[PDB]
Nucleic acid binder design. Structure first.
Lengths: 58, 46, 130, 113, 143
RNA sequence: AGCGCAUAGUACCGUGAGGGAAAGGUGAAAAGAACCCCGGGAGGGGAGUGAAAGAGAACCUGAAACCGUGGACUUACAAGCAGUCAUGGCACCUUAUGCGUGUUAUGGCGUGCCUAUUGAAGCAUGAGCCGGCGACUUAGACCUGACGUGCGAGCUUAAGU
RNA sequence: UUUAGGAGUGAAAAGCUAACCGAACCUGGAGAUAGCUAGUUCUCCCCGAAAUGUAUUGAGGUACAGCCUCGGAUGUUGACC
RNA sequence: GUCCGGGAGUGAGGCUGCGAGAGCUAACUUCCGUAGCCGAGAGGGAAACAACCCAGACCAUCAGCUAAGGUCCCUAAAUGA
RNA sequence: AAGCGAGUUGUCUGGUAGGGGAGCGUUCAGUCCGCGGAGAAGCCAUACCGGAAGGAGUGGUGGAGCCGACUGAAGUGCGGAUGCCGGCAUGAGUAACGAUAAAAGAAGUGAGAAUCUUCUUCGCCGUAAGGACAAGGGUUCCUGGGGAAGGGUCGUCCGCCC
RNA sequence: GGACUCGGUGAAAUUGAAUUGGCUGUAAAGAUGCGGCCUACCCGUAGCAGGACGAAAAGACCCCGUGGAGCUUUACUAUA
């Protein structure tokens, strides 16, 4: 049992305009509460370990 | 279940195993049909 | 106006080896996805290259970046350059030694796969700005 | 194998133990070839000709040091052999005294040792 | 010495009239400008037109006994019920949504005229709402 | 390529006699390499070795579909696998010489090749590409015939020296 | 463990002999031969067609002739008027 | 006008004109012959499209006219009488 | 000393099976004074000429030879034979990790540890998916050890490899 | 439990080549690159079947083939 084989292909031309509707979101937004610079999307260090107060640990 | 062969080769000793082509003289040449006949080693001792 | 005549030199007299070099080969992730973690780092090495590739919600810093600075391990003082410098002009890769292995599939006559492999390429030599 | 030897020179060169010679072929031309044992059937020879530099490691064995003298390279005979003087006249001639083990008399301008 | 494309630079169109629809130089005076009126240096090949400042032309009326009849069509590839050939004064809820579609015979084929569909742009209200396009107001009665 | 063997008809295919690979090459010579780095190590630095290490410890030169990046230029509002020219359009000027090199919105329009086909441009079929194999010839008084020549009374086999 | 190949087995299906037996496989006899049909390789200067007739257990098979090229030739014989 | 020879092709076509045959004179169905055409060459006209009106070429020139086709436009050419 | 045409007129048509006819060049062979170290032959690119095929100007790189005119020989030349092998492919990063018969964690280690290890808790089989004898694989079991590769993640686990 | 977030692995049957919309028409009449006309901001992925005259072995139903094999009948005939 085989469903219509490949035949025609899609090398160049196409397979180009396919790294843009996704790619990677591109970031570099924030740089930590106070010291140094990590932070993530709303999330404390591991440096000083804090958004503004006591947490995590060096 | 049963395959098509399985181990135990007695009928490849005193029949068709090394020295069993004398019982059948015109099998001696058959034994000698790939040793003293053409190139290659043999097929009963790898 | 460097050299031309006497082609037994550039064979005998040349010193050095090849400034840069760090490529550990193998890679194990297609010459198509290698570039995917190099076509983002068009600037600042293990500065805004690392974390850009170190911290990236997956696995692509180990033998991706840890070898990408194996050049630096040699650029320690075995290779040229500096620290507050370095560049890497662009990026390019290829395939490499593989190994027939497979694991039967099903239908047809036979199944035919390839373990696939690459060649990382990691260099830090001929620069620009200072 | 590391193709060097020069075993494509063919084993019939006579040489043995104890002898004073000069050199040629290039690289040096300032090197009195001498002493040595030679190696019939593939021969190695270096003399004080080429001043190699080949640092051995320094485990915990006995070597710990390095070196930088006495080590292999290449270049067999074919330089400047025979002649107490220096050039001209071969030598492979031998007295009718048997003892091929070390026959001694050479050509016209030859030596008997 | 040929032509050159100003690429929008040297243009000086003349505002259309609609000062009384006609029956002969209506769907054809659509040219006499777009293709090359007087021709200052009309560069063939690529497109090259000007602000066909059309007006009201509600005055429009077509021929006589053969008024409410024309090759209307629609084209979709199906003949069961498509291709509504609504007569003139039957399709008379638009007539500013056709008419202009009289330049469907004058386009250098390919692109070109499939770009001149800008100078058209409705218009059937007798000068008011000229906010559609303010620039020209050159008039010049039609011969 | 040549016997399948330029050190294998390894492993084996396997129900059985019986069928089998693929694969060579660094320079004369390895001198196939001490000495600090990331690293688990593989792999990569210094520097000798190396006449010549863009030979390089799976190694001559090393062309290519696919495949690695940037850049001088154009491009999503423009429509046809493709085309060639055509005014423009950015670049360059290995000879100011309003002359060209790397090119394109777009225009006339314009449908592929092989190739068994009356017959098409086809959806008639063969085709993803790379590298080779790519066939009426070879011995034969088998014969006819163009040309040059031997002779007009002409031309030779078997091997014996 | 003998039965085997043109035999045995057999609940007859014309099922099986080792995943297809309308008569096993492998080394060997010849490549079954083939008017079928895929193809039969670099680049060319001047010329040029038949599915008409006769033949055929003969037909998209093939033979030949009018039908093409070339060597020699036909000293008045051409076709039109 | 005038034969001897090395060697072909591949035998199974299409259409308009010329008339019949099987035929509700129906069929790029089928048989026949006779000019052409496409099997071996492109166009204008014909929307583009094998036989239809005109015309079959040595490679190069953004030089001229004839026939068809046209003298409103998308792309030539008097809405001249 | 191998035959050659301007001056000119018609033909120079386009050609499928075909007739007469020219060549580009590689390998073998003749003559090698030879051509190459400033290095030719291997190859990458530049508007001279040629009936087309092709012959030409130079570096690049490369490492030891190589072709020539008069000549004969040779498996003398399609990318294209749904060929054959060798490699690159794309189906495309999706479908899928395997019988859907639960697992969390402390801690050993170290290169980070979720699937190792010392272990309290859970559950599936237990006429079983227990243990021994039968065939088989022959190196399984261990003292353990290292990722190149394999166990279709990988891993500091193997019965990989010593 | 698969279809969607993420880490690794990812092949085969097949295939000239996609700036790969449609009509109606035209064509050895089943045209999307042909005619003439209309029309879309380009791309990504989920999902669906009308679609390429879907795929596979060059229908093996049939005919052509001075093909084969197989069985039967007093077919011509050999023959234990």
């Amino acid at each position: 049992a085989k469903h219509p084989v490949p035949k025609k292909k899609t090398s160049k031309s196409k397979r180009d305009m396919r790294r843009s509707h996704h790619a990677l979101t591109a970031p570099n937004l924030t740089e930590c509460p106070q010291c140094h610079g990590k932070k993530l999307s709303h999330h404390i260090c591991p440096n000083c370990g804090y958004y503004d107060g006591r947490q995590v640990l060096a | 279940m049963k395959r098509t062969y399985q181990p135990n080769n007695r009928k490849r000793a005193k029949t068709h195993g090394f020295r069993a082509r004398m019982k059948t003289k015109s099998g001696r040449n058959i034994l000698a049909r790939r040793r003293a006949k053409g190139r290659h080693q043999l097929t009963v001792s790898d | 106006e460097q050299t031309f005549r006497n082609k037994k030199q550039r064979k005998q007299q040349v010193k050095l080896r090849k400034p840069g070099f760090a490529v550990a080969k193998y890679v194990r992730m297609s010459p198509r996805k290698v570039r995917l973690v190099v076509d983002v780092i068009r600037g600042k090495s293990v500065q805004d290259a690392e974390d850009l590739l170190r911290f990236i919600p997956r696995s692509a810093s180990e033998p991706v970046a840890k070898v990408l600075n194996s050049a630096k391990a040699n650029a320690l003082h075995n290779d040229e350059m500096l620290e507050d410098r370095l560049f890497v002009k662009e990026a390019y890769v290829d395939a490499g030694p593989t190994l027939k292995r497979l694991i039967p599939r099903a239908r047809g006559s036979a199944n035919i796969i390839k373990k696939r492999t690459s060649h990382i390429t990691i260099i830090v030599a001929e620069k620009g700005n200072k | 194998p590391r193709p060097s030897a020069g075993s494509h020179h063919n084993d019939k060169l006579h040489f043995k133990k104890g002898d004073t010679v000069i050199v040629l072929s290039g690289k040096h031309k300032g090197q009195t070839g001498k002493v040595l044992l030679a190696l019939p059937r593939d021969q190695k020879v270096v003399v004080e000709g080429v001043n190699v530099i080949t640092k051995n490691v320094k485990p915990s064995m006995t070597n710990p040091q390095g070196g930088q003298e006495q080590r292999e390279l290449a270049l067999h005979a074919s330089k400047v052999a025979l002649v107490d003087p220096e050039t001209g006249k071969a030598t492979r001639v031998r007295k009718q005294i048997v003892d091929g083990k070390k026959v001694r008399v050479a050509v016209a301008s030859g030596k008997t040792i | 010495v040929k032509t050159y494309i100003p690429k929008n630079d040297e243009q000086n169109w003349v505002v259309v009239d609609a000062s009384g629809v006609p029956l002969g130089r209506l769907a054809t005076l659509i040219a006499s400008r777009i293709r090359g009126k007087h021709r200052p240096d009309f560069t063939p090949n690529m497109i090259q037109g000007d602000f066909v400042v059309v007006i009201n032309a509600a005055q429009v009326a077509l021929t006589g006994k053969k008024l409410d009849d024309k090759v209307y069509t629609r084209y979709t590839g199906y003949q069961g019920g498509l291709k509504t050939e609504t007569a003139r004064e039957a399709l008379s809820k638009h007539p500013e949504r056709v008419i202009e579609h009289a330049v469907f015979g004058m386009l250098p084929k390919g692109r070109q005229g499939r770009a001149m569909h800008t100078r058209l742009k409705v218009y059937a209200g007798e000068t008011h709402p000229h906010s559609a396009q303010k620039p020209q107001v050159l008039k010049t009665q039609p011969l």
